[PDB]
């Protein structure tokens, strides 16, 4: 799934 | 954890002027690789769900009016409204989208300033139906006034009463920018029948003398 | 446009509750769900987030022992479970769903949770006629629990010059009032009625405003 736009991409996905 | 500090907490402006509010974070919200600041702004109108306005510190979501601008980098950010309108009345929040937890700021409340307006006062004796139940409430309505600062006192037979009073205010109207208030004095049917004169006395900036509305129980 | 959330909940202290959020119009596996809390007259508070890619959830440390977010992909519904409720848990809980394919954020209407041991009570409605150009009439709704009650004038026909005040709680009972201003030609020649409905107690009542 495409990363959450407004959120910092380095946090995604939840480990 | 990253602390979000918003200021000012309250802001009163007149239609058409440029507004600016600040949001500061305890740590940088900048991602070096993407060169973007992950700060998000929301708007919450009275009684409604929040709405996202801007993300990445300065990118507007589709549909958001052009008068809403966001800027800043690192730890200092601002939201500006060019030509604030009557519908821009709301609370604005900034949020950390850089790292967990995604903390919100305390918010900045935006209110509108308009010309002073005197309150229209109306007093209402207890309805016969309530009296049959052994209760007696006297209602006083103070509608469409500005500014918000107002003081209401209840006088029974000339003496002030400070018990059994319940007040309530509406939010600032999104059209005429005025406020309205409701004050209810509740007594027992017995306590009510012991006195005669009931007075709702309001003190507002628009008058040097207190605005008085009254009635006598034994009359009709 | 807007997500669906479950109705208002009245729950007693110490008990738990489970709220739901259905993403009608979207496959929940493509949505990033967030739960946000808002106590009366206070600011927004982030509780946690559900990852659509693996089902893992992240929380704010202060909500870790109170909240639990789960999902049922088959029915497109996400849940928020709150345990050992106290008066600090009385608030409106919002469901936030971000759809990255449209770069759009969607919100639900919020679910109001009231933590109290008070019992459900139907309201007493009283018509307020002027004291014995323009004329202002009113309607007093007293002694009901819990919120909300909906009030309209003339079944909603009369909507201009109306002021409905926020309910105020006192000793486990709410009081609400409303005023309507009409021209002196409209009343009493034409009837004006106050209509009140209280969903929680399944009651309704109409009160006609008649001169004293």
XYZ file of C-alpha atoms in Angstrom:
447
model
C 0.000 0.000 0.000
C 1.224 3.511 -0.904
C 2.742 5.265 2.136
C 0.635 7.707 4.181
C 1.315 11.010 2.398
C 1.296 13.433 5.363
C 3.519 11.146 7.480
C 7.318 10.881 7.517
C 8.160 7.951 5.171
C 10.922 6.710 7.522
C 8.328 5.706 10.129
C 6.546 3.404 7.683
C 5.696 0.654 8.010
C 5.093 -0.189 11.706
C 7.743 -2.703 12.771
C 8.603 13.189 22.933
C 8.235 16.292 20.762
C 6.342 19.169 22.386
C 4.170 21.367 20.169
C 3.652 24.948 21.345
C 1.015 27.106 19.670
C 0.470 30.838 20.145
C -1.461 32.902 20.723
C -4.146 30.823 22.455
C -6.880 33.289 21.438
C -7.020 35.824 18.608
C -9.656 38.465 17.812
C -9.602 39.967 14.320
C -11.761 42.021 11.952
C -12.980 40.788 8.564
C -10.482 41.365 5.783
C -7.257 41.553 7.777
C -4.246 39.239 7.570
C -3.955 36.744 10.416
C -0.857 34.847 11.563
C -0.524 32.081 14.156
C 2.574 30.187 15.264
C 3.438 26.551 15.977
C 6.844 25.638 17.431
C 8.277 22.170 17.991
C 10.937 21.181 20.540
C 12.873 19.408 17.761
C 13.364 19.729 14.010
C 10.636 18.170 11.863
C 12.840 18.080 8.753
C 13.702 14.894 6.868
C 17.062 15.463 5.132
C 16.525 12.803 2.456
C 13.131 14.146 1.291
C 13.812 17.787 2.265
C 10.295 18.126 3.702
C 9.015 19.256 7.100
C 6.262 16.999 8.426
C 3.998 19.513 10.136
C 0.229 19.312 9.604
C -2.473 21.970 10.168
C -6.158 21.317 10.979
C -9.285 23.453 11.351
C -12.165 22.658 13.683
C -15.375 24.664 13.447
C -17.731 24.700 16.482
C -19.506 21.361 16.772
C -17.817 19.830 13.717
C -15.117 17.244 13.027
C -11.578 18.514 12.399
C -10.549 19.106 8.779
C -7.026 18.878 7.356
C -5.893 22.116 5.710
C -2.156 21.790 5.073
C 0.468 19.027 5.205
C 4.261 19.073 4.651
C 4.180 22.497 6.338
C 3.007 24.295 3.180
C 1.031 21.984 0.866
C -2.732 22.517 0.761
C -5.166 19.643 0.406
C -7.465 19.834 -2.640
C -10.405 22.142 -2.056
C -8.741 24.285 0.617
C -9.150 28.044 -0.157
C -6.137 29.989 -1.474
C -6.208 32.417 1.476
C -4.768 29.702 3.746
C -0.971 29.672 3.563
C 1.549 27.699 5.578
C 5.292 28.248 5.909
C 8.349 27.650 8.048
C 11.062 25.041 8.438
C 12.927 23.241 11.189
C 11.199 24.169 14.453
C 9.224 27.349 13.645
C 6.037 27.262 11.565
C 3.159 29.638 10.819
C -0.352 29.540 9.370
C -1.593 32.720 7.698
C -5.055 33.733 6.528
C -5.152 36.546 3.943
C -8.456 38.348 4.369
C -10.164 36.430 7.153
C -13.898 35.915 6.633
C -16.824 35.300 8.974
C -16.750 31.546 8.339
C -13.083 31.252 9.323
C -14.280 31.253 12.912
C -12.730 28.082 14.404
C -9.870 26.557 16.393
C -6.686 25.783 14.471
C -4.341 22.930 15.428
C -0.856 21.910 14.314
C 0.422 18.331 14.615
C 3.739 16.491 14.566
C 3.878 13.981 11.678
C 7.663 13.534 11.926
C 7.799 10.837 14.614
C 5.763 9.007 17.268
C 3.767 10.006 19.134
C 1.964 12.257 16.594
C 1.247 15.007 19.148
C -1.164 17.916 18.590
C -0.602 21.470 19.787
C -3.030 23.159 22.214
C -4.661 25.175 19.425
C -5.376 28.811 18.579
C -8.963 30.034 18.883
C -9.979 32.612 16.255
C -12.830 35.046 17.007
C -14.242 37.944 14.982
C -14.529 41.595 15.952
C -17.551 43.617 14.835
C -19.322 46.819 15.905
C -20.881 46.801 19.388
C -24.443 45.464 19.527
C -26.868 45.841 22.444
C -28.603 42.683 23.743
C -32.340 42.181 23.301
C -33.653 41.071 26.696
C -36.797 39.022 27.388
C -38.057 37.596 30.698
C -40.420 34.635 31.127
C -42.476 33.675 34.216
C -42.927 29.956 35.095
C -45.378 28.010 32.901
C -48.540 26.755 34.633
C -47.502 23.169 33.857
C -44.215 23.445 35.739
C -45.977 24.965 38.754
C -48.339 21.978 38.882
C -45.205 19.831 39.336
C -44.020 21.860 42.324
C -41.227 23.668 40.505
C -40.686 27.201 39.213
C -38.084 28.384 36.695
C -37.732 31.998 35.504
C -35.981 32.410 32.159
C -34.141 35.412 30.776
C -32.909 35.572 27.179
C -30.224 38.061 26.090
C -29.868 37.786 22.310
C -27.575 39.139 19.599
C -24.953 41.182 21.450
C -21.280 42.137 21.111
C -18.803 42.094 22.754
C -19.091 38.786 24.618
C -18.441 40.298 28.071
C -21.737 40.568 29.940
C -22.925 40.281 33.539
C -26.352 39.069 34.649
C -27.847 39.406 38.137
C -31.153 38.162 39.514
C -33.068 40.395 41.920
C -36.066 39.044 43.835
C -37.997 41.792 45.631
C -34.991 44.057 45.140
C -32.529 41.653 46.800
C -29.832 39.843 44.811
C -30.001 36.042 44.555
C -26.981 33.783 44.082
C -28.429 30.262 44.121
C -30.445 28.238 41.631
C -28.981 30.039 38.612
C -27.888 28.254 35.455
C -26.295 30.133 32.524
C -25.497 29.093 28.950
C -23.885 30.838 25.958
C -23.972 30.101 22.236
C -20.864 30.148 20.044
C -20.200 33.270 17.986
C -22.619 33.321 15.042
C -20.926 32.509 11.716
C -22.898 35.246 9.924
C -23.568 38.299 12.126
C -20.729 37.565 14.593
C -22.896 38.078 17.702
C -23.361 36.106 20.927
C -26.513 35.096 22.803
C -27.068 34.014 26.390
C -29.664 32.185 28.439
C -30.045 32.432 32.216
C -32.439 30.293 34.247
C -33.394 30.764 37.903
C -34.997 27.680 39.469
C -36.941 27.679 42.727
C -39.510 25.449 44.412
C -43.186 26.350 43.889
C -43.323 27.432 47.541
C -40.206 29.624 47.488
C -41.565 31.218 44.307
C -44.907 32.139 45.863
C -43.208 33.806 48.840
C -41.960 36.734 46.757
C -43.461 39.067 44.151
C -41.001 41.049 42.024
C -38.598 39.143 39.748
C -35.852 41.014 37.903
C -33.271 40.095 35.271
C -30.551 42.758 35.325
C -27.800 42.862 32.683
C -24.700 45.050 32.512
C -23.102 45.430 29.089
C -20.574 47.792 27.478
C -23.283 49.270 25.198
C -25.060 50.983 28.100
C -24.102 53.134 31.085
C -27.255 52.009 32.914
C -28.113 48.327 33.543
C -30.665 46.785 31.162
C -33.642 45.691 33.267
C -36.547 43.341 32.508
C -39.037 42.458 35.225
C -42.511 41.259 36.218
C -44.730 40.839 39.298
C -46.049 37.369 40.149
C -49.433 38.486 41.518
C -50.231 40.396 38.317
C -51.319 39.444 34.801
C -16.891 11.590 2.066
C -17.306 10.681 5.729
C -16.655 7.498 7.670
C -19.363 5.846 9.757
C -19.034 5.632 13.529
C -21.209 3.925 16.140
C -23.807 5.820 18.179
C -23.496 7.589 21.536
C -22.561 5.464 24.554
C -23.539 5.838 28.201
C -21.275 3.579 30.266
C -20.808 3.259 34.034
C -17.451 3.788 35.858
C -15.141 0.772 35.829
C -16.765 -0.832 32.793
C -15.293 -1.022 29.296
C -16.609 -0.091 25.844
C -15.857 -0.843 22.182
C -16.396 1.831 19.519
C -16.467 1.093 15.784
C -15.535 2.889 12.568
C -16.661 1.593 9.162
C -14.903 2.946 6.072
C -17.829 2.823 3.649
C -16.552 3.569 0.148
C -13.060 2.244 0.824
C -11.373 -1.104 1.296
C -10.039 -0.806 4.862
C -6.795 -2.486 3.766
C -5.944 0.685 1.823
C -6.689 3.143 4.639
C -4.541 4.450 7.499
C -6.768 4.572 10.587
C -6.089 6.933 13.515
C -8.160 7.433 16.684
C -8.346 10.920 18.249
C -9.853 11.921 21.618
C -11.372 15.266 22.621
C -12.635 16.015 26.115
C -15.269 18.785 26.561
C -13.817 22.216 25.747
C -10.293 20.744 25.514
C -7.917 20.121 22.619
C -7.380 17.154 20.298
C -5.376 14.159 21.608
C -3.795 11.447 19.447
C -4.442 7.922 20.793
C -2.987 5.586 18.176
C -2.691 4.310 14.598
C -3.481 1.002 12.825
C -1.164 -0.125 10.004
C -3.159 -1.522 7.027
C -0.165 -3.452 5.675
C 0.277 -5.764 8.680
C -2.341 -5.108 11.363
C 0.193 -3.694 13.844
C -0.825 -0.773 16.069
C 1.199 2.079 17.622
C 0.035 4.152 20.629
C 0.862 7.241 22.633
C 2.480 5.912 25.859
C -0.232 7.514 28.004
C -2.987 5.483 26.276
C -1.093 2.173 26.163
C -2.809 0.624 29.175
C -6.283 1.982 28.386
C -6.786 1.638 24.626
C -6.633 -1.213 22.121
C -7.240 -0.825 18.381
C -8.263 -3.839 16.282
C -9.686 -4.424 12.788
C -12.039 -6.730 10.894
C -11.060 -6.488 7.214
C -14.029 -8.616 6.118
C -16.514 -5.939 7.234
C -14.309 -2.838 6.729
C -14.533 -1.962 10.422
C -11.876 -0.738 12.849
C -12.477 -0.758 16.613
C -11.313 1.183 19.666
C -11.555 -0.647 22.982
C -11.335 1.330 26.225
C -11.062 -0.422 29.594
C -11.624 0.630 33.230
C -13.414 3.851 32.327
C -13.278 6.915 34.607
C -14.677 10.454 34.259
C -11.453 11.378 32.407
C -12.666 9.141 29.561
C -15.839 11.174 28.949
C -15.195 12.664 25.512
C -15.876 12.518 21.798
C -13.726 9.959 19.977
C -12.956 10.622 16.300
C -12.041 8.130 13.598
C -9.526 9.499 11.082
C -8.872 7.704 7.801
C -6.160 8.806 5.370
C -6.397 7.547 1.777
C -2.958 8.167 0.282
C -4.016 7.353 -3.306
C -6.081 10.563 -3.347
C -3.800 12.399 -0.862
C -6.979 12.979 1.136
C -7.874 12.857 4.823
C -11.359 11.694 5.850
C -13.025 12.068 9.255
C -15.990 10.415 10.943
C -18.638 12.411 12.883
C -17.230 11.292 16.231
C -18.720 9.091 18.962
C -19.719 10.709 22.235
C -18.949 8.639 25.354
C -20.396 9.658 28.733
C -19.011 7.846 31.794
C -21.622 8.130 34.543
C -23.693 6.125 37.001
C -26.747 8.360 36.439
C -29.926 6.829 34.972
C -31.660 7.606 31.693
C -34.446 10.140 32.305
C -36.982 11.602 29.872
C -37.315 15.416 29.777
C -40.111 17.692 30.965
C -40.900 20.308 28.298
C -42.355 23.732 29.154
C -43.712 26.444 26.787
C -42.620 30.034 27.514
C -45.156 32.710 26.554
C -44.447 36.484 26.921
C -45.143 38.261 30.208
C -48.846 38.766 30.928
C -43.019 45.120 16.626
C -41.401 41.778 17.462
C -42.148 39.063 20.004
C -39.802 36.429 21.452
C -41.092 32.994 22.499
C -39.211 30.188 24.221
C -39.074 26.521 25.154
C -37.530 25.012 28.319
C -36.354 21.371 28.359
C -35.537 20.326 31.915
C -34.295 17.239 33.749
C -33.134 14.766 31.107
C -30.210 12.355 30.804
C -28.152 11.664 28.800
C -27.542 13.913 25.788
C -28.796 14.640 23.244
C -32.282 15.995 22.601
C -33.273 17.574 19.305
C -35.596 20.564 19.317
C -37.320 22.218 16.374
C -40.018 24.864 15.953
C -43.071 24.100 13.784
C -41.469 20.803 12.739
C -38.478 22.670 11.333
C -40.460 25.103 9.159
C -39.535 27.958 11.478
C -35.736 28.210 11.359
C -34.900 31.932 11.233
C -34.459 33.922 14.426
C -33.878 30.741 16.417
C -31.337 30.312 19.202
C -30.823 26.909 20.785
C -28.490 27.022 23.762
C -25.976 24.306 24.720
C -27.240 21.951 27.435
C -25.834 22.425 30.949
C -25.380 19.512 33.362
C -26.185 19.911 37.046
C -26.607 17.056 39.533
C -26.836 14.362 36.841
C -29.553 16.187 34.877
C -29.356 18.480 31.838
C -31.307 21.656 31.115
C -31.612 23.150 27.642
C -33.577 26.123 26.297
C -34.440 27.728 22.968
C -35.801 31.087 21.825
C -37.531 32.095 18.597
C -38.230 35.658 17.489
C -41.090 36.379 15.090
C -42.950 39.503 13.938
C -45.910 40.625 16.072
C -48.181 39.823 13.102
C -47.218 36.129 13.051
C -48.130 35.390 16.677
C -50.626 34.685 18.148
C -52.609 34.724 14.868
C -50.588 31.707 13.718
C -49.628 28.822 15.996
C -46.041 28.180 17.030
C -45.085 24.795 18.445
C -41.957 23.488 20.133
C -41.102 19.879 19.129
C -38.751 17.856 21.332
C -37.324 14.358 20.910
C -35.125 12.369 23.301
C -33.692 9.274 21.518
C -32.312 7.623 24.668
C -35.757 7.368 26.279
C -37.723 7.001 23.024
C -39.993 9.933 23.873
C -41.340 12.950 21.988
C -43.601 15.847 22.908
C -45.135 18.892 21.250
C -45.868 22.075 23.198
C -47.925 24.856 21.636
C -47.038 28.375 22.842
C -50.289 30.031 23.924
C -50.776 33.516 25.442
C -51.134 33.777 29.233
